[PDB]
């Protein structure tokens, strides 16, 4: 297939790598973005939005990005912390009093955001409709007894991360806006990414969505994976896309992702508009822990919401940060090279981070520097 979009001359290799992933049959449809020093310099897409290869991927095509969304949610908290509304060292219960229930009165915001609160998933079996009821799910989580002692371990809050992070965000802004609207107003819209990444997709935009394509447990792992179990299929359901499930249901593309991480990699600015101070970025990316994860099963290096680089997952800068999603999407920022990168596609592969397609794109990108 023929690659569409724009690519600065010095980044031609990246374009080639992108195209290469199609030639090897590893893609159906995909989008990719790369920002350098506060400007988008690569903006590419290709292939098809559907399994039948009858509808080409377009510039404004959207796809579910799964846990790539967690990075977006973390950015909201970061921005709010940068404005002085949230103290990472403060107790969650200072902002969210009900959260103090069942052993969590001393859990800090930094611990909640680094998956150390121990409420990795709902203890009781939940329906998808339950996921869509924000206040009810949040009330349930605040009342829940942790699977492990808070601060003594990390266990990936695989689905509910967006709700707990987001509810803190909503509480310090007086519950006047949903987490999706806070992301729209404070992160995406100012830098012009508001049309390329949504948490809670408006009906008017739903025609843009491409089709998602599929390829003993402790109490914590089991609840994080079974309550409820996520599938490729659910991404293709309108109710899922319409809801706000900020751990997993972001609708976006490579350009939107790359714009947000592009701002973050450039000290908080993209195309002359600032969404956050550099101090704010430093504070939201402080390493909180580096331990074998109770849910993921490997050593995770967690900051206040972002995955910190390990084994060159996010390139050669050891302090690069970002988040990846089930199937292969990802985004990350590198403040040294002032580089932000985004990638979103509809053909899933078996991984939750470190897809080969991404490895290729990352290597190509850093050859051009």
Closest among 345, 270, 368, 256 to 26, alpha carbons compared? 345
Closest among 334, 342, 328, 338 to 315, alpha carbons compared? 334
Residue written as token pair 């846990």: 67
Q: 344 near 68, Cβ under 8 Å?
A: yes
In whole angstroms, give the CA distance from residue 321 to residue 318.
9
Cα distance from N-terminal residue to C-terminal residue, the chain: 28
In whole angstroms, give the CA distance from residue 42 to residue 65.
19
Q: How was this structure determined?
A: X-ray
Resolution (angstroms) equals: 2.0
In whole angstroms, give the CA distance from residue 325 to residue 110.
22
Structure-token pair, residue 293: 């994860």
In whole angstroms, give the CA distance from residue 338 to residue 349.
29
Alpha helices in 96-246 (DSSP H): 109-113, 128-132, 134-142, 161-171, 179-183, 219-226, 232-235, 238-242
Long-range contact pairs involving 304-311 (C-beta distance under 8 Å, separation at least 24): 304/74, 304/77, 304/78, 304/88, 304/109, 304/110, 304/113, 304/114, 305/70, 305/71, 305/73, 305/74, 305/75, 305/77, 305/78, 305/113, 305/114, 305/165, 306/71, 306/74, 307/353
Nearest-10 Cα torsion for 241, 244, 246, 252: 40
Q: What does the radius of gyration of the chain's CA atoms come to, in whole angstroms?
A: 19
């Amino acid at each position: 297939i023929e690659i569409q979009g724009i690519c600065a001359p010095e980044f031609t290799k990246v374009r080639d790598a992108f195209a290469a992933n199609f030639k090897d049959g590893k893609e159906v449809g995909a989008s990719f973005g790369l920002a350098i020093e506060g400007e988008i310099v690569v903006d590419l897409w290709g292939g098809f939005a559907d399994a039948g290869r009858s509808r080409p991927w377009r510039s404004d095509t959207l796809i579910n990005t799964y846990s790539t969304t967690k990075g977006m949610a973390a950015t909201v908290v970061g921005v709010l912390a940068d404005e002085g509304l949230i103290d990472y060292n403060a107790r969650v219960a200072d902002y969210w009093p009900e959260f103090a229930a069942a052993g969590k009165k001393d859990v800090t915001v930094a611990q909640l955001l680094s998956h150390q609160a121990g409420i990795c998933g709902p203890r009781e079996r939940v329906e998808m409709a339950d996921l869509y009821d924000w206040d009810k799910l949040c009330a349930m989580l605040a009342a829940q007894w942790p699977f492990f002692e808070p601060g003594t371990a990390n266990g990936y809050h695989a689905v509910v991360f967006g709700h707990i992070a987001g509810e803190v965000a909503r509480r310090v802004t007086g519950r006047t806006k949903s987490l999706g609207q806070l992301f729209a107003e404070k992160v995406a819209s100012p830098i012009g990414a508001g049309n390329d990444y949504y948490i809670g997709l408006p009906a008017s935009e739903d025609h843009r969505v491409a089709e998602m394509l599929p390829v003993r447990m402790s109490d914590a792992l089991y609840c994080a994976m079974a309550h409820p179990p996520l599938t490729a299929h659910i991404a293709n359901d309108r109710a899922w896309r319409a809801a706000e499930v900020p751990g997993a249901n972001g609708q976006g593309n490579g350009r939107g992702i790359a714009k947000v991480y592009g701002a973050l990699a450039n000290g908080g600015t993209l195309g002359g508009t600032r969404i956050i101070s550099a101090k704010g970025i430093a504070e939201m990316t402080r390493e909180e822990c580096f331990r074998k994860d109770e849910v993921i099963g490997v050593r995770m290096r967690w900051s206040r919401g972002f995955i910190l680089n390990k084994a060159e997952l996010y390139g050669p800068n050891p302090d690069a940060f970002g988040h990846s999603g089930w199937g292969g999407s990802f985004g990350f920022a590198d403040t040294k090279a002032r580089l932000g990168m985004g990638y979103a596609m509809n053909q899933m592969d078996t991984n939750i981070f470190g897809d080969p397609r991404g490895v290729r794109l990352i290597e190509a990108a850093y050859r051009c520097l």
